[PDB]
Structure 1
Amino acid sequence: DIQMTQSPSSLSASVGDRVTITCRTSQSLSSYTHWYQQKPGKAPKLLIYAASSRGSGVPSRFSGSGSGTDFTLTISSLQPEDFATYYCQQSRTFGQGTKVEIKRTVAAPSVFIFPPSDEQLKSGTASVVCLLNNFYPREAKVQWKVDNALQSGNSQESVTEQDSKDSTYSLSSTLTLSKADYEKHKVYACEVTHQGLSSPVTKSFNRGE
């Protein structure tokens, strides 16, 4: 029966900011709301228990408060390592989570292009990888050109979560071609647009060199 509603569903705040997340219960008389912090690829960790007690190993910048059905989690001074999703809980019910993102200064990506390995070519497929390293904010455009022809529908992107030390993102774009198609062209180019750059950056190689 107990329902838990968390607000906001996400937020961005600067390092040093005071951050407040709310959880509102319904159909409960209990004041024992617990909070968890979950970082990418890790299990949730108990952060606050029984509305206001700090969990083992939890620093003093985290605090909890509760009044009737309204519970709050406060980070008094946000740090880059507090990038996480925060969940409230009562009994067998979890809230939906609040994603805390770190707002920081603009940072242009470092761009690298990788040809397919000879080993992979033997398998009949060629993957060409473009890496954008350590940039902020997340918005970035990556375009593939093969002998100057813009490519469409043959690439996939993946992005990391914000880094726990410098709050940047990194991104990969992978162009997949058959070996025969790879061998028919010479110039492979990754063109990157990002607000940290004064104009688009292109990295390229020539197949065979």
Structure 2
Amino acid sequence: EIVLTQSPATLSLSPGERATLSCRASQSVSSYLAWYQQKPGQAPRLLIYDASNRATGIPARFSGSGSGTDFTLTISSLEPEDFAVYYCQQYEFFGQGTKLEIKRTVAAPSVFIFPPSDEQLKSGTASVVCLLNNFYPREAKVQWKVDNALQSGNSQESVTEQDSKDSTYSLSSTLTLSKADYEKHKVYACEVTHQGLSSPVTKSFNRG
């Protein structure tokens, strides 16, 4: 089996800049390597074939080179529609893929917390939402603490795709408890850590 390793996992660049993506194979391949572009919800699109030949209707800014075990894809000057995921393929094997992301100045998250609704508590369940709003970069750590007890397993978070105006992100984190166990405690906190924050931020509420 041939393994195709792409690097980096996420490439953050600004429009107009030059992007260079790499794909390495486990064994020598000569030049039987293809590249593909895929946007969310859409089917792949062939960009390069034979490692360096542009496919049908591909702009000149796309190009690839390499042989044997080292291959590269290069966009000479990125443009808005170029930000997407890129895969390399060799015979029956595909690469893990590289996500091309828009870079921008650091943006700190606006942190808000929502206690359970009353209607939900009547039914024996309690959900607590913690919103990180319009921040950048993507990476963020969210930890729940009930009466200073670090929680685990009972939360799940969801992140939005990059906003098409401020290139920002938004993340939700929902902590799900039973009404019983939610009443056994009082202080429900949401500790956030992000590069745009000099110190970690913790938002909380009482009356559990």
Work out whether residues 157 and 171 of structure 1, in 8 Å CA contact, stay in contact via their aligned partners in 2. Answer: no
Q: Give the letter aligned to residue 11 of structure 2.
A: S
Q: Does residue 114 of structure 2 align to residue 114 of structure 1?
A: yes
1:72-91 matched pairs, under 5 angstroms? 72-79=72-79, 82-91=82-91
Work out whether residues 65 and 73 of structure 1, in 8 Å CA contact, stay in contact via their aligned partners in 2. Answer: yes
Please state how far the C-alpha of 1:60 moved relative to its aligned partner.
4.4
Structure 2 unmatched ranges of 5 or more: none
Query: Partners in 1 of 2:24 and 2:145 — Cα distance?
Result: 51
Q: 1:83 to 1:150 in 2, by over 3 A?
A: farther
Please state how far the C-alpha of 1:184 moved relative to its aligned partner.
4.3
Q: Which residue of 2 aligns with 1:100?
A: 100
Please state how far the C-alpha of 1:125 moved relative to its aligned partner.
1.5
Q: Which residue of 2 aligns with 1:46?
A: 46
Work out whether residues 4 and 23 of structure 1, in 8 Å CA contact, stay in contact via their aligned partners in 2. Answer: no
- Cα shift readout 1:130-171 (whole Å, capped 9, x = no counterpart): 01122222343434344x534422542424365163443332
> Given the two structures, how large is their TM-score scaled by the length of structure 1?
0.72
SS in structure 2 opposite 1:108?
coil
Percent of residue pairs identical: 71
Q: Give the letter aligned to residue 151 of structure 2.
A: S
Please state how far the C-alpha of 1:65 moved relative to its aligned partner.
3.9
Structure 1 unmatched ranges of 5 or more: none
Work out whether residues 7 and 98 of structure 1, in 8 Å CA contact, stay in contact via their aligned partners in 2. Answer: yes
SS in structure 2 opposite 1:180?
helix
Query: Partners in 2 of 1:151 and 1:68 — Cα distance?
Result: 50
Please state how far the C-alpha of 1:69 moved relative to its aligned partner.
6.8
Query: Partners in 2 of 1:13 and 1:149 — Cα distance?
Result: 36
SS in structure 2 opposite 1:112?
strand
1:1-209 matched pairs, under 5 angstroms? 3=2, 5-15=4-14, 16-23=16-23, 26=27, 28=29, 31=31, 33-40=33-40, 42-50=42-50, 51-56=52-57, 58-65=58-65, 71-79=71-79, 82-146=82-146, 148-153=147-152, 155-160=154-159, 163=162, 165=164, 166-207=166-207
Query: Partners in 1 of 2:124 and 2:68 — Cα distance?
Result: 64
> Given the two structures, how large is their TM-score scaled by the length of structure 2?
0.72
Query: Partners in 1 of 2:87 and 2:49 — Cα distance?
Result: 12
Work out whether residues 7 and 23 of structure 2, in 8 Å CA contact, stay in contact via their aligned partners in 1. Answer: no
Please state how far the C-alpha of 1:107 moved relative to its aligned partner.
0.7
Query: Partners in 1 of 2:44 and 2:207 — Cα distance?
Result: 46
Query: Partners in 1 of 2:199 and 2:71 — Cα distance?
Result: 47
Work out whether residues 28 and 68 of structure 2, in 8 Å CA contact, stay in contact via their aligned partners in 1. Answer: no
Q: 1:132 to 1:94 in 2, by over 3 A?
A: same
Please state how far the C-alpha of 1:18 moved relative to its aligned partner.
1.5
Query: Partners in 2 of 1:97 and 1:188 — Cα distance?
Result: 39
